[PDB]
């Protein structure tokens, strides 16, 4: 009875050696990607060559697309930083619709925002936080390689997103685009937390999707020219193991989720960690358990067939230690999954199991990065801060802690501090754009 439950959850409980191997293999994927060999990490240059270098003034507009929230932002950088913002809705219809409609909508929001802020005629430098993989050969350009997460907008892949915006601006007849800067949310976060922490050289995202960036030494980035200095690299680690190198880890439940997704075979490592997917990993487990007769006494809970019932907000609430079992059951009776205690206990165990692996994997990841940076600089010890954002990370009872613990376990010679971004990527984006303006003048 409970024997089957543990047998089933066994693969989600990774021992030290297993986790070390994950770190080992990411470390290898990083090496290869940078030398231009075949890696599942794209290791994309971002052309951000320094964390916030002292004073960098300017008033910037800022887009933030690809997260749970799409937001337009005004960012005023002087002695201090002042941000105004407004969220707008992007339904799956628009997100997976036509590129034309997508950016038409984006522009409409900018006009709306601008009109509400009195910006109006003034065409400001835009800091575009665009949380997807781009091939950049400069701050002011970024060719979308692939959509990820919940996006599938047509006629966009292979397009420079700065162009995609121009074409929309001209169509919606908005104010002419000025200096635009493309930044990944990881890079945006890193730079935001970097504003008031010089040792911040890594951006980590664990929300809808997961990814990381970090300051690599320029000599090691074979794709780009130059030797002196360093440059931030967007690892795009969500797609880690897309080459099938993480077959060792994939459970049957991971498989079921992947095949059932918009992008089968893609972003495999992400599908074992981030908020968009964890809830589903659980659901399949529960389905398997019910069919084994363990859960629900075999009885068919059709509601369990419904996709995306276990959301981050829920996964974070279910595991709160301040909940009594009656309250856990209440929550599930409130999602249309009434449970008996025993069932409720197994469900809660399943969540812990999944979210644990999620935190641990991410930990092994951060471990590889911090080690890479340390070894890159020939150091025996490293003090480094990680600018981190994401609702899962930010809300989940144990995730952040379990990561920090894993980073100690696996990268002891490094002293890693985690900074939670209080102001989002818009702040960092603006700082990057400041350089992009200097780079034009
Ligand atoms: O998908 P989530 O939970 O909103 O987390 C990721 C996002 O978190 C936001 O706070 C950042 O400003 C975005 O740049 C980022 O993409
Ligand atoms: O938003 C978090 C992450 O989502 C996906 O992994 C994207 O590929 C990546 O660009 C982004 O950083």
């Amino acid at each position: 009875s409970r024997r089957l439950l543990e047998e089933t959850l066994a693969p989600f409980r990774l021992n030290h050696d297993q986790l070390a191997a994950v770190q080992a293999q990411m470390r290898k994927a990083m090496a290869k990607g940078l030398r231009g060999e075949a890696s599942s990490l794209r290791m994309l240059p971002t052309f951000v060559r320094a964390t916030p270098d002292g004073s960098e003034r300017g008033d910037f507009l800022a887009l933030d697309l690809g997260g749970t929230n799409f937001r337009v932002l005004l960012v005023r950088v002087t002695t201090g930083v002042q941000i105004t913002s407004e969220i707008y809705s992007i339904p799956e219809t628009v997100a997976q619709g036509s590129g034309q409609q997508l950016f038409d909508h984006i522009v409409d929001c900018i006009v709306d925002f601008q009109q509400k802020q009195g910006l109006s005629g003034q065409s400001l430098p835009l800091g575009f936080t665009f949380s997807f993989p781009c091939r950049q050969l400069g701050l002011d350009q970024g060719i979308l390689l692939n959509w990820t997460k919940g996006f599938k907008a047509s006629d966009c892949e292979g397009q420079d997103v700065v162009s995609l915006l121009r074409e929309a601006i001209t169509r919606r007849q908005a104010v002419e685009l000025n200096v635009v800067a493309i930044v990944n949310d990881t890079v945006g976060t890193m730079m935001s937390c970097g504003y008031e922490d010089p040792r911040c050289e890594i951006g980590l995202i664990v929300g809808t999707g997961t990814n990381a960036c970090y300051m690599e030494e320029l000599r090691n980035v074979a794709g780009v020219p130059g030797d002196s200095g360093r440059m931030c690299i967007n690892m795009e680690w969500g797609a880690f193991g897309d080459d099938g190198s993480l077959a060792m880890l994939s459970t049957r439940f991971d498989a079921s989720v992947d095949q059932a997704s918009i992008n089968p075979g893609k972003q495999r490592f992400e599908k074992m960690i981030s908020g968009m997917y964890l809830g589903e990993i659980v659901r399949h487990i529960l389905l398997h358990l019910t069919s084994l007769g363990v859960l629900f006494r075999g009885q068919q809970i059709q509601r369990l067939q419904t996709r995306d019932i276990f959301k981050t907000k829920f996964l974070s609430e279910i595991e709160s230690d301040s909940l009594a079992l009656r309250q856990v059951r209440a929550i599930l009776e409130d999602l249309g999954l009434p449970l008996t205690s025993d069932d409720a206990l197994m469900v809660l165990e399943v969540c812990q199991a999944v979210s644990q692996r999620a935190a641990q994997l991410c930990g092994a990841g951060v471990a590889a990065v911090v080690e890479k940076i340390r070894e890159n600089r020939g150091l025996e010890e490293l003090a480094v801060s990680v600018g981190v954002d994401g609702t899962l990370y930010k809300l989940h009872p144990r995730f952040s802690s379990l990561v920090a613990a894993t980073v100690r376990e696996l990268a002891p010679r490094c002293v890693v501090t985690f900074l939670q971004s209080e102001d989002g990527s818009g702040k960092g984006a603006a700082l990057v754009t400041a350089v992009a303006c200097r780079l034009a003048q």
Side-chain angles (χ1 to χ4, degrees), residues 4-31 33-41 43-52 54-56 58-60 62-70 72-78 80-88 90-91 93-99 101-110 112-114 116-118 121 123-151 153-171 173-176 178 180-227 229-247 249-255 257-296 298 302-312 314-317 319-325 327-393 395-397 399-401 403-408 410-412 414-421 423-437 440:
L4 288 175
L5 174 63
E6 302 312 310
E7 285 177 35
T8 292
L9 293 180
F12 291 81
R13 311 212 151 115
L14 292 175
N15 85 320
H16 177 85
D17 289 4
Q18 285 163 328
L19 284 165
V22 171
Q23 181 186 16
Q25 179 169 37
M26 179 161 298
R27 201 75 151 71
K28 183 177 182 179
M30 293 168 73
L34 292 167
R35 318 192 306 261
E37 296 197 350
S39 173
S40 43
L41 301 178
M43 303 289 291
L44 304 169
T46 72
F47 284 79
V48 169
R49 311 195 170 180
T51 59
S55 195
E56 303 160 35
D59 302 346
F60 310 85
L63 286 172
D64 191 351
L65 179 67
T68 63
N69 291 313
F70 166 58
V72 182
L73 298 138
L74 178 53
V75 190
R76 274 202 178 79
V77 183
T78 57
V81 170
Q82 193 182 28
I83 293 174
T84 316
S85 77
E86 180 165 331
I87 297 176
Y88 298 97
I90 291 179
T93 304
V94 182
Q96 307 170 346
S98 75
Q101 280 196 351
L102 184 55
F103 289 84
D104 278 9
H105 189 69
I106 290 169
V107 179
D108 292 327
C109 297
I110 298 162
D112 176 275
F113 189 76
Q114 286 176 325
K116 280 155 180 283
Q117 297 292 351
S123 87
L124 295 175
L126 196 154
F128 202 158
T129 316
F130 182 75
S131 48
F132 299 94
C134 297
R135 177 58 58 174
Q136 306 197 236
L137 301 67
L139 291 175
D140 66 341
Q141 61 185 250
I143 292 74
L144 175 72
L145 298 174
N146 294 289
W147 289 114
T148 56
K149 299 171 287 188
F151 287 69
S154 69
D155 310 305
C156 286
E157 296 183 342
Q159 287 278 48
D160 170 23
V161 301
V162 166
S163 290
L164 294 185
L165 195 56
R166 246 189 293 279
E167 290 164 6
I169 277 181
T170 54
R171 279 197 303 272
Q173 293 185 338
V175 185
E176 180 183 5
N178 200 47
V180 170
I182 289 299
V183 294
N184 189 247
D185 52 346
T186 57
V187 176
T189 310
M190 186 200 69
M191 296 290 295
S192 305
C193 304
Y195 180 65
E196 284 202 323
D197 183 335
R199 298 280 68 100
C200 189
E201 295 190 300
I202 301 167
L204 176 59
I205 299 300
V206 188
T208 300
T210 186
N211 189 8
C213 67
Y214 72 92
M215 303 297 292
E216 176 63 55
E217 305 300 302
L218 187 56
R219 66 175 165 279
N220 298 142
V221 186
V224 161
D227 305 306
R230 47 187 61 158
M231 185 179 295
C232 181
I233 280 181
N234 175 13
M235 302 178 64
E236 282 299 320
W237 79 16
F240 176 46
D242 282 17
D243 51 13
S245 60
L246 302 193
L249 295 196
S250 299
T251 67
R252 58 177 292 159
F253 311 109
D254 292 309
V257 168
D258 185 43
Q259 289 158 4
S261 71
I262 282 175
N263 60 340
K266 269 47 187 175
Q267 303 290 115
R268 298 190 193 180
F269 187 70
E270 185 170 61
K271 288 165 177 181
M272 300 187 297
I273 300 175
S274 77
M276 191 182 204
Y277 302 116
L278 292 193
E280 287 286 296
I281 307 185
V282 171
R283 193 168 67 79
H284 289 284
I285 290 162
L286 299 181
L287 285 162
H288 178 67
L289 291 170
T290 57
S291 67
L292 294 185
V294 169
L295 210 59
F296 301 92
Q302 191 173 337
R303 178 57 176 183
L304 211 67
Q305 295 286 11
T306 302
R307 282 177 46 86
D308 295 311
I309 54 197
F310 306 138
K311 295 180 170 150
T312 306
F314 162 90
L315 291 181
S316 297
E317 285 175 45
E319 298 190 52
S320 169
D321 71 27
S322 59
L323 280 185
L325 195 57
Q327 298 169 292
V328 153
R329 296 176 65 201
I331 296 173
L332 291 163
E333 294 152 26
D334 214 43
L335 283 180
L337 280 182
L339 291 176
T340 50
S341 296
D342 287 322
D343 294 355
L345 290 173
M346 288 181 282
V347 173
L348 192 34
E349 182 165 4
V350 180
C351 294
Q352 295 168 358
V354 162
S355 66
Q356 180 165 336
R357 190 190 67 173
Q360 294 191 311
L361 285 176
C362 176
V366 182
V369 168
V370 291
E371 285 283 289
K372 179 97 170 71
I373 298 173
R374 187 175 68 77
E375 185 166 326
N376 283 354
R377 302 173 192 195
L379 298 171
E380 276 161 29
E381 166 176 56
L382 179 48
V384 59
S385 306
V386 176
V388 61
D389 208 319
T391 49
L392 182 63
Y393 183 91
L395 296 182
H396 198 276
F399 200 96
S400 66
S401 290
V403 164
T406 309
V407 174
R408 287 187 279 267
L410 292 181
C414 296
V415 177
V416 178
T417 300
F418 290 82
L419 304 166
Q420 178 130 231
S421 182
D423 307 320
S425 298
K427 188 185 176 194
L431 292 170
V432 176
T433 306
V435 184
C437 297

